[PDB]
Design a protein around this ligand. Structure first.
Ligand SMILES: Nc1nc2c(ncn2[C@@H]2O[C@H](COP(=O)(O)OP(=O)(O)OP(=O)(O)O)[C@@H](O)[C@H]2O)c(=O)[nH]1
Ligand SMILES: Nc1nc2c(ncn2[C@@H]2O[C@H](COP(=O)(O)OP(=O)(O)OP(=O)(O)O)[C@@H](O)[C@H]2O)c(=O)[nH]1
Ligand SMILES: Nc1nc2c(ncn2[C@@H]2O[C@H](COP(=O)(O)OP(=O)(O)O)[C@@H](O)[C@H]2O)c(=O)[nH]1
Ligand SMILES: [Mg+2]
Ligand SMILES: [Mg+2]
Lengths: 95, 426, 156, 376, 427, 436
C-alpha cells in the first residue's frame, strides 16, 4: 500500500526497516537507492532528471536477449536447406 | 514506408517525448551522437519510419516539439539524446500559458499554430507514405492541452485520411496538480471526441500505484513514469518496425477496437513488470504474461474494469512465441470471467505477434482495452465541473479572453451525452 | 556454434522460441496424445491363406499369410542356406536331423544346381539382417514375373 | 559423483536419421549413461557397462554400447574439455630406416610405455620431399647429408598422444647421440637401436608448433607423401580394432616382420559402407549374421593395414596365410599354436588379423587399401 | 501440363513460402536456382541452369514481401513476381476491395497474363488466401472475379483459411468472411477449407509438438497441396488431373466446399513404432480427429470423396479398404449418389524437410471429401454475424470506405440461401 | 510428482535452513541457485524437479515458504548465505510476534497473515502440476508455529482436503523444556492436529540430545547439529521420490500402510547409523546391525520406551548399497525375536523400501560418509503414553487457572479449554482401546 522509509536516508541500506530487500537489490545493480538526487546530494548546482532509468523500470538480466539473437521467425524457420545445422536429428544423406 | 510523425505538446508532452525518443533510439541502436552503432541488420531496414538519414549516417528524428516556456526546451536539450533533434523542430513561443485553456487555444495558439503548421507540413511532405500522426500531451496544462488540441483540429482538417493516436494524461482527485483541471479537461475531451481518432488515456495515480506495488520502487521519479509510458508507445508501434507472424498496424487496431465513432477512449497496460529483487521468480511464458495483463492493478488508468464490461480488447505481443498458447490463453480469459465482456460481440480480443522484444526483455505484451468503465473517470470530472460552474469560480480568466459560457455548457452536455452512451452499452 | 552444449541457444533457434519441456513438466500428455488412430480389425476365416482385408503382411521368412506360394516363387531369395544342405548341431528340428537325403549322388546334383545358380543369384537385395527386401513394383505396366505362361523355359 | 560428458551421434541404419546423444561416463563406478538431446528424455537408465576402456574414448573413437556404434563427436562440458585437453598432446614420432627392421618392437615399447597411436603411415620419400621435411635445417651440411640418408630406406611416420607427450616422448628417445646414451641409460630407444649420432633411429618433435607443421606434412588434410607399394606377389594383413585397442599391434608387426618384409602400412578408420564393400567376397560365402558381425567389427574403430611381402619375391599369399593359421581363433589354437591368430586372436569374430585367402585378389585388396581408400 | 499458383495476403504468402520450400526440395532444386522434366509444371527453365517458379506473391504491406526478398530464397523468386503495396488493408473488406485493389490488381493481372503466355499447357489457377483479413479477402475476391471474366473456363482451385468457431484472432472476421463468401461461391470452382483449430489439435495430438506456431501449420498444408498435385508432377499407376476434382466431386454448380484430411500425421519416433499399411491409414483418414476443418461429419452425409495415394500402393489393397469403408455403417453416404469414391495413385513417396517434424513415410493418403457438415459451418458463422449486425456494430468503417448496408444484407441473405441449399441436398 | 513444504515458526524455518542446504548439496546446486558453470546439467534430468522448479534458464527456486510473525529469524535468512536461493517474495514475515500465545497466534495476527499465505500457496500449487501433497514444519510448543500453524492447516484442508499433509512436529520434552505455557499450546494444537493432518511424525528434543551425546559423542550440541540430522531424516524419507530405487514408495503409502485408524496417526521416527568419523573406521556397518540399531530406544527421535508399547506397524527406508536379500533376512530375524512384540491383530507389520543413492555428507558436518542408512518410521502405543504425560502437566497448571487470563484477554474462553482437555482424554481412551 504505502512504503515506510524514514531510515536509510543516506545512500546505503544498513538497517532492515522498510522495504530493504528490493532497495538492496537495486543498490547492487545501479549503486543508487531511492532517488538519484539523494546520492549526488550526499556526494557533494544541478537537478535529478538525468537518470539511467532502464535497469530500474524494465530489464531482466537472465532473460535478456542480445541483439545478436534477434531473428525473425521466418529467418529462424527457413534456414538454407543444403547446410542447415541448427537441428539435432535430420535425415542424413546416405548414398 | 509507412511514416509516423511525432508531435509533443507542453511540458508533459515534451518530457515524455524526450524519453520516448530515447527508447526508440535505443531499440534501433543509434548512439546519442546520431550515428548507428547497433549490430543486427534487422534495425537498418525500418528506421525510415522514425528517422531520416541526413549525411554521414546522421539519423535525425521526425518529431515536432511545441511549448511556450524555455524551461522545457532546456530540459529537452540538456539530457542525453538531446542534440539529435533538428534545430528547426524547436518551434517555440516565449510568453507562457499557465493553466489557461483560453490562452492556450485562442491567444497563444493564434500566433504559434501557424508556424508549427509550417513545420508539420514540411516534415509531412518530407516523407512519402504517411501512416498518421502520434501526439503526446496533457489535459490539465494550458500550453499542452489547448495548443495541442488546436493543432489536432487543424491537422485533422487538412489531412483527413491519416490515423491519429493521442496519449493524453488526465487529472486525478487524490493527486490533483492544478486547480482548473476540470475547466481544461472538459473542453479538451469535448474537442477530442470530434477530432481525434483514438485516445489512450493515461493518469498519474495508476502509474504511481504501479511503481508502488508491481515495481516496489521507493521513490518513483518522473523518469520512471515517462519510461513506462514510452514503453507502451514502443509496444504499440512495434508492428511497422519489425517483422512478425501476424502484423497489425495502427489502422488494424482501430477497426478491431472502435465499434462506434464516438466510442474510442481506451485504457492501456504493459507486461511484464516486476521488481529488481524479484526478476528471477518469474518465467516468461504466456500464462504468466496474461495473468498480469488482465490484472486490474496493471491498468494505466484509474478505472476498475471489474466495474463494467469490456467492449473490445487488443494484445500486441513481441518476441518469438507460440500462437496456439497465445490464442488459447485469450480464449480462457474470455470464457472464465465471461460476465465482464459484452454479450452481442463474439471474440472481443484481437491479438498480434511481432518477433522483436524490447531491448532488455525476452517476451513482452501491450494491452489496449476499450472498456465501458471509463465513464467512471468522466463522471469523476463532470461532477467537479458542475460543482465549479454552479457558482462561476475561476471563470473570468476564461470569459475575459474570448470564451463564453455556452462553451462550458456545450462541453458539459457532450460529456454527459457520452457517458450516457457508455452507460447504455453497459 | 555450441547448439546443444548450452540451452539458452537451444531456445534461440527453436522454432517456437522455447525448447521442449520435461516430461513431468508438460501439463497434458500420456493417455491423451496416444496415436491410436491408425487402427483396424482383420477378419480372418478359419483357413484363409491370404488376407483380402488389406492389413499389413508378414515377411515371407515368417510362415504365415500365404507364405507357401511365395517361398515357392522364382524371384524369391532366402538369406540362409536350405535345410537339406545345412550342417551342424544347434537348431536341428528332430524331424530334420533324422530325415536327410539318403543318396550322396542326389546330394551332389542338388549342390551343383544350388551353388551355380541360387546361392549367389542375388545379393544386393539381401539386407544387413539377412532378410531380403520384397521387389517393389515401379510403373503401371511393371509385372513381377510370368504367372500365366509359367513354363517359359523348359527341360532342366 | 564424476561425469565425463560427450556429444556423440548415432545414425540408425533402418531409419537413416542421425541424432546426437549426450553420453556421460562415470569412471568411478565403471558406469555409463546417455540422454537424448532433441527430446530431453533418458535413453539409458544409468546402466553399468564397464565393457569400454577409459583409454578408448579420446573424442575420436567409436564406442559400442548395446550394439550401437556411436562415435564421440564433441566435448559436452567445459569441465570435461579441460580435463581431456590436458591429457591429449600431439607429437610426431617418425622412425628412421635403421630400426625400421624392428618397428613392431619399438611400437610395442610405445604402447606399453603408455601412448595412443592416432595416425600411422609407412612410406619411403624421395630426396625432394625429404628436404621438404627437416626444412628448418637447410643450411647445415650435417643435415644436408641427413636429408639424403633419410630418403633411402622405408620410414614409419606415426603420431603419439598422451599427457605430457612432447616431454615423455623426447625423453624415451634419448639424446641425439646413441653411444653416450648406451653408456648412460640403455633403456632409451635411441640407445637401444642406435648406431651413431647420425644413424639415430627414434626421431621425434621438440616444440608444439614444430610438431604441428610436421604432422601436417605427414598426415595433412589431403596429403599422401612418398607412397611405397608393390604390384604383385604381396598379400595384405589387417590388424583389427581389437589389437590396436589393446596395443598388441607391436606384438604382431615384429612377429610378421621376422619372416616377411612389410612394404606399406597405415592406421585409418573406415566407414560401414566402405567396410562392407571391401568384404563383398564373403557375403555368399558366410552366413549373414556372421558376415555382418565381421563387417561391423572391422568398422568398430581404427585398424592397421600391413602390405606384407615375401623375401624371395615369389609369392606372399600362400605362406602368409599358413602363418595366420586357421580362420577360427579357437580351432587354430589347439593344433596350430605358432600362428598369430592362435597367439593373440580372441574369438570367432574377435580373431587376431585378417588375411586374403585367394591368390587372385592379393593385388586387388592391397591396391584398394592403398590407392582407392585414401584418394576417396 | 503446367499450373500456376497465386498467394494473397499475410497468410497466402506464408503458406506459399512453405509450399515453395517443399517444391524445391521435392525436385531437388538448390535454393539459388539450379539443379546440381517433371519439374516443368512449377519451375520454368530460363537460359541454362536456372529455374524460376510460376507464382506471384502479393500483399499490401511490403513487410512480409521484402522479408521474403531478404529470406533464404533470394535468387529463386523472380524479382518482379513479388508484388507489394505500400500500406495495409487492415482487416477491412471494403478497404481491400475498392480503395487499393483498384490500383494493385491491374498490375497483378497484367503480370499473370504474361506468366500464362510464357506457359504452354496451363491446367488452371491455384489460389491460397485467408478470408478473415482485408488484404486476402478484399482484393483476393476482386482478382478472383477479374480472372473469371478473363479466362473463366480454366479451373480455379481455392484453398482458403476460414475462421474457427472459438479460437479466433480478429473481431470483424465475421463481416469479412461473409462478404468474401458471396464471391467465393460464384467464382471459385473447387473451394477447400483450411481451419486453424483443427490443425492445432492435429499438431498437439499426432505430432505432439506442445507449442506450435504458424510455420508447422504452413508446413503440413504444403504437404497436402504437394500430395494432390503429385499426380500431375510424377507418373503413377492411376493418374488424375485438376479437371477431375471439377467432375468427380462437384454434383451441383453451387455446392463446391470440401473437407480435407491427410494421413499419416506421424512424428519421427512413431514411424518406428507403427507398421504403416493401407488399411489403417485409409481408416485414419476418416475420423474427425484427422480432418483439417473443425467439424464432425457424423452429423452429415457424405456426397463424394477423392483419395490421392503416394508411394508403395498396390490397387488391390486400396480397393479392399474402401470396400470395408462402404460396408461400415459408422459413417453413412447419401443415397442420391451410390458410388461416391474416386482413387488416384502416384508412385513417389512424400519427402521430408530438414527440421520438419513429419517422418519419412512409405505411403500417404490425402482425402478431399464433400459433405454437409460444411453447411453446419456456415450456419455457425451466420449466427454470430447476426448477433453483431443487429446492433449496427463496426458498420461505419466499411461505409466510410464507400460501401453501404445493402451489400451486408444481400450477403447475409446469400449465405441464408446457401443454408437452404445444403438442407435441401442433405435430404 | 511434486511436493511442497511450508515452515511455520522459529523452529520450522531453522530446520528448513538446514534442510534446503542439504538438498542443494545433494543435487550439486551452488547456493546462488544454479549449478557450477563448469559441469553441464543432464538435459533430461528431472531428479531435482520434485522440489525445485527451474524458472527460465539456470535457476532453481525451492517449492517452500518460510513464514512467521517475528522478522528476526526471517530476515536473518534474507541476509544469510542463501540470499540468492530464495528471492524475497516467498519469505513471508509479520510485524509482531504471537509470543507463545496460542490465541494470539490463531485469532489476532493469523487473520492478517493467513490470507497472504493462502494466496501465495495457491500460485505455488498453480506452478505445480502433479502435486503429491504438503509437508509442514512446526514446533507446537511455541506460539507462532502452533496457533497460525493450526489455522493454516485448517484452511489448507478446506482448500484441497484430499491431498496428504505430512506434519513433522516437535513436541515438548517432559523434563527438558524452555517454555512455560507450552503444555497449553500443545493441547490446543493437538485439538486441530487430530482432524487436519493425515500423517504426523513426532520429533522430540531430549531424545536428539541423547543421540548426539551417545552416538555422535558430541558432549555439547547447539541447534545446528540437531537440525542437521533432522534434515537427514527428511531427506532420507523423500529420497524415494527424488531417486529411483529398487523398491520405492511415495507419499501416499504412509497414508495406507501406517495409519490403521483415521485418528491414530503419530509416528515415532528413528535413524541409523548415526555415527561419527572415528567410530566408523573401527566398526563395519552392514544391514543386519543397522536394522538392529534402528529399534533400540537409544536411537529414537522421541524420548519414550517402545518396550512399554506394542508396534502397530513399521516402515524401513534403506538408502545406499543394500540388496533385498539381507533386509529380508534382517526383518525375518526381527520378527522372530521376542524382545519386541507387534500388536497381535495385525500379523504383517513391516513396509520395506530400498533406494540406490547413498546419503551424502555436509561440509563441516559431523556425520561421516556411510555406504548405507536406515530410516525407521513406526507406530505404537508409547505415543499414547506421551499424550497422557502432557495431559497431566496441562491439568496441573489449569487447576489454578494460571496464565488463562492472557488467552481470555485475547478473546478466547473456557469452552475451548474444556473441549481440548476432553478431546485428549477421548484420545487417550482410543489408544488404550486399540492397544488391547
Ligand atoms: N494457418 C495459418 N493461418 C494464418 C497464417 N498467417 C495468417 N493466418 C490467418 O490469417 C488471419 C488474419 O488475416 P491475416 O493473414 O493475418 O492478414 P490479411 O489476411 O493479409 O489481411 P490484412 O491484415 O488486412 O493484411 C488470421 O486469423 C490467421 O489465422 C499462417 O501462416 N498459417
Ligand atoms: N529442533 C529444534 N527445535 C527448536 C529449535 N528452536 C526452537 N525449537 C523449539 O521450539 C520451541 C518453542 O517454539 P519456537 O520455535 O522457539 O518459537 P515459535 O514456535 O516460533 O513461537 P514464538 O516464539 O511465539 O514465535 C522450543 O520448545 C524448542 O524446543 C531448533 O532450532 N531446532
Ligand atoms: N508522468 C508525467 N506527468 C507529467 C510530466 N510533466 C507533467 N506531467 C503532468 O502534467 C500535469 C500538468 O501539465 P502541465 O505541465 O501544466 O501541461 P502544460 O503546462 O500545458 O505544458 C500534471 O498533472 C503532471 O502530473 C512528466 O514528465 N511525466
Ligand atoms: Mg494481413
Ligand atoms: Mg517463535
Amino acid at each position: 500500500t504505502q512504503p515506510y522509509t524514514s531510515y536509510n536516508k543516506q545512500d546505503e541500506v544498513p538497517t532492515l526497516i522498510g522495504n530493504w530487500v528490493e532497495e538492496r537489490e537495486l543498490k547492487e545493480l545501479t549503486g543508487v537507492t531511492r532517488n538519484l538526487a539523494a546520492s549526488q546530494a550526499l556526494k557533494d548546482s544541478l537537478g535529478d532528471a538525468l537518470t539511467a532509468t532502464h535497469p530500474r523500470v524494465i530489464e531482466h538480466v537472465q532473460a535478456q536477449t542480445h541483439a545478436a539473437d534477434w531473428q525473425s521467425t521466418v529467418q529462424a524457420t527457413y534456414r538454407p536447406p543444403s547446410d542447415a545445422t541448427r537441428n539435432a536429428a535430420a535425415y542424413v544423406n546416405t548414398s | 514506408m509507412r511514416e509516423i510523425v511525432h508531435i509533443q505538446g507542453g511540458q508533459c508532452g515534451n518530457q515524455i517525448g524526450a524519453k520516448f525518443w530515447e527508447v526508440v533510439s535505443d531499440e534501433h541502436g543509434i548512439d546519442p551522437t546520431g550515428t548507428y552503432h547497433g549490430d543486427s541488420d534487422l534495425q537498418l531496414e525500418r528506421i525510415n519510419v522514425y528517422f531520416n538519414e541526413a549525411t554521414g549516417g546522421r539519423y535525425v528524428p521526425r518529431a515536432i516539439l511545441m511549448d511556450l516556456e524555455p524551461g522545457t526546451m532546456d530540459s529537452v536539450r540538456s539530457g542525453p539524446y538531446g542534440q539529435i533533434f533538428r534545430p528547426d523542430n524547436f518551434v517555440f513561443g516565449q510568453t507562457g500559458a499557465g493553466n489557461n485553456w483560453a490562452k492556450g487555444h485562442y491567444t497563444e495558439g493564434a500566433e504559434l499554430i501557424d508556424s508549427v503548421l509550417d513545420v508539420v507540413r514540411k516534415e509531412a511532405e518530407s516523407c512519402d507514405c504517411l501512416q498518421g500522426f502520434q501526439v503526446c500531451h496533457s489535459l490539465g496544462g494550458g500550453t499542452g492541452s489547448g495548443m495541442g488540441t488546436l493543432l489536432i483540429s487543424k491537422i485533422r482538417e487538412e489531412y483527413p485520411d491519416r490515423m491519429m493516436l493521442t496519449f493524453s494524461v488526465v487529472p486525478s482527485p487524490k493527486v490533483s496538480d492544478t486547480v482548473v483541471e476540470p475547466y481544461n479537461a472538459t473542453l479538451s475531451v469535448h474537442q477530442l471526441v470530434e477530432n481525434a481518432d483514438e485516445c489512450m488515456v493515461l493518469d498519474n495515480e495508476a502509474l504511481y500505484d504501479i511503481c508502488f506495488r508491481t515495481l516496489k520502487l521507493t521513490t518513483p521519479t518522473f523518469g520512471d513514469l515517462n519510461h513506462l509510458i514510452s514503453a507502451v508507445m514502443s509496444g504499440i508501434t512495434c508492428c511497422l518496425r519489425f517483422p512478425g507472424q501476424l502484423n497489425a498496424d495502427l489502422r488494424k487496431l482501430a477497426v478491431n477496437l472502435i465499434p462506434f465513432p464516438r466510442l474510442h477512449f481506451f485504457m492501456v497496460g504493459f507486461t511484464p513488470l516486476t521488481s529488481r529483487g524479484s526478476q528471477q521468480y518469474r518465467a516468461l511464458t504466456v500464462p504468466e504474461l496474461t495473468q498480469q495483463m488482465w490484472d486490474a492493478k496493471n491498468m494505466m488508468c484509474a478505472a476498475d474494469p471489474r466495474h463494467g464490461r469490456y467492449l473490445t480488447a487488443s494484445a500486441l505481443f513481441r518476441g518469438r512465441m507460440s500462437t496456439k498458447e497465445v490464442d488459447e490463453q485469450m480464449l480462457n480469459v474470455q470464457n472464465k470471467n465471461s460476465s465482464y465482456f459484452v454479450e452481442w460481440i463474439p471474440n472481443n480480443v484481437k491479438s498480434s505477434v511481432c518477433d522483436i522484444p524490447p531491448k532488455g526483455l525476452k517476451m513482452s505484451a501491450t494491452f489496449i482495452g476499450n472498456s465501458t468503465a471509463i465513464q467512471e473517470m468522466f463522471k469523476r470530472v463532470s461532477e467537479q465541473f458542475t460543482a465549479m460552474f454552479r457558482r462561476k469560480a475561476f471563470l473570468h480568466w476564461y470569459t475575459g479572453e474570448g470564451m463564453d459560457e455556452m462553451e462550458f455548457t456545450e462541453a458539459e452536455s457532450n460529456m454527459n451525452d457520452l457517458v450516457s452512451e457508455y452507460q447504455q452499452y453497459q | 556454434s555450441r547448439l546443444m552444449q548450452d540451452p539458452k541457444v537451444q531456445d534461440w533457434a527453436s522454432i517456437a522460441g522455447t525448447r521442449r519441456s520435461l516430461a513431468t513438466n508438460v501439463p497434458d500428455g500420456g493417455p491423451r496424445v496416444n496415436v491410436n488412430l491408425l487402427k483396424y480389425k482383420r477378419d480372418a476365416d478359419f483357413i484363409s491363406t491370404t488376407p483380402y482385408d488389406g492389413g499389413p503382411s508378414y515377411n515371407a521368412e515368417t510362415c504365415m499369410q500365404n507364405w507357401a506360394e511365395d517361398r515357392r516363387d522364382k524371384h524369391y531369395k532366402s538369406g540362409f542356406h536350405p535345410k537339406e544342405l545345412r550342417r551342424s548341431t544347434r537348431y536341428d528340428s528332430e524331424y530334420s536331423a533324422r530325415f536327410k537325403p539318403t543318396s550322396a549322388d542326389y546330394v551332389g546334383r542338388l549342390t551343383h544346381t544350388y551353388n551355380t545358380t541360387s546361392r549367389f543369384e542375388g545379393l544386393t537385395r539381401v539386407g544387413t539382417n539377412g532378410i531380403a527386401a520384397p521387389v517393389l513394383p515401379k510403373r503401371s505396366a511393371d509385372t513381377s514375373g510370368e504367372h500365366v505362361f509359367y513354363a517359359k523355359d523348359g527341360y532342366g | 559423483n564424476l561425469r565425463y560428458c560427450f556429444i556423440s551421434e548415432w545414425l540408425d541404419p533402418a531409419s537413416g536419421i542421425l541424432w546426437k546423444y549426450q553420453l556421460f561416463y562415470y569412471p568411478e563406478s565403471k558406469e555409463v549413461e546417455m540422454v537424448d538431446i532433441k527430446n530431453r528424455r533418458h535413453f539409458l537408465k544409468r546402466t553399468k557397462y564397464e565393457e569400454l576402456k577409459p583409454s578408448l574414448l579420446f573424442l575420436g573413437s567409436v564406442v559400442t554400447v548395446f550394439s550401437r556404434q556411436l562415435k564421440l563427436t564433441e566435448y559436452g562440458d567445459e569441465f570435461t574439455r579441460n580435463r581431456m585437453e590436458s591429457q591429449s598432446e600431439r607429437t610426431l614420432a617418425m622412425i628412421k630406416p635403421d630400426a625400421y627392421k624392428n618397428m613392431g618392437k619399438i611400437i610395442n615399447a610405445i604402447c606399453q610405455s603408455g601412448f595412443l597411436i592416432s595416425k600411422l603411415r609407412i612410406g619411403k620419400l624421395s630426396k625432394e620431399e625429404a628436404g621438404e621435411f627437416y626444412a628448418v635445417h637447410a643450411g647445415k651440411p650435417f643435415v644436408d647429408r641427413l636429408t639424403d640418408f633419410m630418403s633411402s630406406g622405408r620410414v614409419v611416420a606415426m603420431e603419439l598422444v598422451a599427457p605430457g607427450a612432447i616431454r615423455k616422448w623426447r625423453e624415451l628417445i634419448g639424446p641425439t647421440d646413441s653411444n653416450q646414451a648406451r653408456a648412460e641409460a640403455p633403456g632409451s630407444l635411441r640407445a637401444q637401436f642406435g648406431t651413431d649420432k647420425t644413424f639415430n633411429a627414434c626421431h621425434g618433435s621438440d616444440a608444439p608448433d614444430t610438431a604441428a607443421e610436421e604432422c601436417n606434412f605427414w598426415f595433412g588434410p589431403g596429403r599422401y607423401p612418398g607412397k611405397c607399394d608393390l604390384a604383385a606377389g604381396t598379400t595384405l594383413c589387417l590388424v583389427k580394432p581389437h589389437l590396436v585397442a589393446d596395443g598388441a599391434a607391436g606384438l604382431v608387426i615384429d612377429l610378421i616382420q621376422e619372416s616377411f618384409e612389410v612394404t606399406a602400412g597405415g592406421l585409418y578408420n573406415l566407414d560401414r559402407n566402405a567396410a562392407a564393400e571391401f568384404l563383398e567376397v564373403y557375403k555368399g560365402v558366410l552366413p549373414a549374421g556372421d558376415f555382418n558381425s565381421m563387417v561391423e567389427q572391422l568398422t568398430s574403430g581404427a585398424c592397421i593395414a600391413l602390405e606384407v611381402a615375401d623375401r624371395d619375391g615369389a609369392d606372399a599369399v600362400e605362406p602368409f596365410r599358413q602363418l595366420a593359421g586357421p580362420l577360427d581363433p579357437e580351432l587354430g589354437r589347439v593344433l596350430r599354436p605358432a600362428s598369430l591368430r592362435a597367439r593373440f586372436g580372441l574369438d570367432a569374430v574377435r580373431n587376431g588379423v585378417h588375411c586374403t585367402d585367394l591368390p587372385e585378389d592379393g593385388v586387388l585388396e592391397v591396391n584398394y587399401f592403398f590407392t582407392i581408400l585414401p584418394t576417396a | 501440363r503446367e499450373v500456376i499458383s497465386i498467394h494473397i495476403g499475410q497468410a497466402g504468402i506464408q503458406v506459399g513460402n512453405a509450399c515453395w520450400e517443399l517444391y524445391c526440395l521435392e525436385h531437388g532444386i538448390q535454393p539459388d536456382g539450379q539443379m546440381p522434366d517433371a519439374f516443368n509444371t512449377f519451375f520454368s527453365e530460363t537460359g541454362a541452369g536456372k529455374h524460376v517458379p510460376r507464382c506471384i506473391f502479393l500483399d499490401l504491406e511490403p513487410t512480409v514481401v521484402d522479408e521474403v526478398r531478404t529470406g533464404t530464397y533470394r535468387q529463386l523468386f523472380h524479382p518482379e513476381q513479388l508484388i507489394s503495396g505500400k500500406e495495409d488493408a487492415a482487416n477491412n473488406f471494403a478497404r481491400g476491395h475498392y480503395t487499393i485493389g483498384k490500383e494493385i490488381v491491374d498490375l497483378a493481372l497484367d503480370r499473370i497474363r504474361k506468366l500464362a503466355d510464357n506457359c504452354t499447357g496451363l491446367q488452371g489457377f491455384l489460389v491460397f488466401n485467408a478470408v478473415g483479413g482485408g488484404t486476402g479477402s478484399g482484393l483476393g475476391s476482386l482478382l478472383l472475379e477479374r480472372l473469371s471474366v478473363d479466362y473463366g473456363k480454366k479451373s480455379k482451385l481455392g484453398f482458403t483459411v476460414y475462421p474457427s468457431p472459438q479460437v479466433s484472432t480478429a473481431v470483424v472476421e465475421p463481416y469479412n468472411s461473409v462478404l468474401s463468401t458471396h464471391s467465393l461461391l460464384e467464382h471459385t470452382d473447387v473451394a477447400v477449407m483450411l481451419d486453424n483449430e483443427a490443425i492445432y489439435d492435429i499438431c498437439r495430438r499426432s505430432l505432439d509438438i506442445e507449442r506450435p506456431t504458424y510455420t508447422n501449420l504452413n508446413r503440413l498444408i504444403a504437404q497436402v497441396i504437394s500430395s494432390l498435385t503429385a499426380s500431375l508432377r510424377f507418373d503413377g499407376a492411376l493418374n488424375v488431373d485438376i479437371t477431375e476434382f471439377q467432375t468427380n466431386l462437384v454434383p451441383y454448380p453451387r455446392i463446391h466446399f470440401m473437407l480435407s484430411s491427410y494421413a499419416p500425421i506421424i512424428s519421427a519416433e512413431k514411424a518406428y513404432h507403427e507398421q504403416l499399411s493401407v488399411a489403417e491409414i485409409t481408416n485414419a483418414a476418416f475420423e474427425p480427429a484427422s480432418m483439417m476443418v473443425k467439424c464432425d461429419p457424423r452429423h452429415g452425409k457424405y456426397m463424394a470423396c477423392c483419395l490421392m495415394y503416394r508411394g508403395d500402393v498396390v490397387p488391390k489393397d486400396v480397393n479392399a479398404s474402401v470396400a470395408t469403408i462402404k460396408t461400415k455403417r459408422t459413417i453413412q453416404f447419401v443415397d442420391w449418389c451410390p458410388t461416391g469414391f474416386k482413387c488416384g495413385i502416384n508412385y513417389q513417396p512424400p519427402t521430408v524437410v530438414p527440421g520438419g517434424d513429419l517422418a519419412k513415410v512409405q505411403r500417404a493418403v490425402c482425402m478431399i471429401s464433400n459433405s454437409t457438415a460444411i453447411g453446419e459451418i456456415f450456419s455457425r458463422l451466420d449466427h454470430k454475424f447476426d448477433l453483431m449486425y443487429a446492433k449496427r456494430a463496426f458498420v461505419h468503417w466499411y461505409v466510410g470506405e464507400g460501401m453501404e448496408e445493402g451489400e451486408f444484407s444481400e450477403a447475409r441473405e446469400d449465405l441464408a440461401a446457401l443454408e437452404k441449399d445444403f438442407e435441401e441436398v442433405g435430404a
